[PDB]
Amino acid sequence: VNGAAIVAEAYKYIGTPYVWGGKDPSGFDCSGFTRYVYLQVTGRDIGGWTVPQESAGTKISVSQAKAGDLLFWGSPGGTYHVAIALGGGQYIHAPQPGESVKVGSVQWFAPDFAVSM
């Protein structure tokens, strides 16, 4: 149950199309994807939407994010996006209604804070 396992589970759903409110491999939104990964690996249910997922661990800087941690866009209480940290400025996410689950870099779109799990 290390972050490597979270990353390995998240990689299984690359190419899953975006579906608003989707919570399973037929379609994910940003929060549904992270919730599903953590449900598969740990069995516990972090929030179904973005803001409850801000409580699942301890807040931390994006620099101090290891593989498996959660990354949040927006301010605490008003986060609008989440991804799973891959380490080294990389993450994996359900990006937006346009796109399917894919990898991304903080050099493209930088998250605002992170959460250790």
Catalytic member of 6, 7, 10, 30: 30
Per the CB < 8 A criterion, the answer to whether 16 and 56 are in contact is: no
Report the DSSP beta bridge partners of residue 83: 71
Catalytic member of 31, 53, 81, 91: 81
Radius of gyration of the chain (CA): 12
Per the annotation, the verdict on 93 as an active-site residue is yes
Q: To what resolution in angstroms was this structure determined?
A: 2.4
One-letter-per-residue 3-state SS of 14-79: CCCCECCCCEECCEECHHHHHHHHHHHHHCCCCCCCCCHHHHCCEEECCCCCCCCCEEEECCCCCC
Per the annotation, the verdict on 81 as an active-site residue is yes
Per the CB < 8 A criterion, the answer to whether 47 and 67 are in contact is: no
Catalytic member of 3, 93, 94, 101: 93
Contacting residues for 93 by C-beta, under 8 A, at least 6 apart: 30, 33, 34, 81, 82, 83, 84, 101, 102, 104
DSSP annotation of 7 reads: H
User: Residue 11: what are its φ and ψ, rounded to 5°?
Assistant: -65, -20
The residue count for the chain: 117
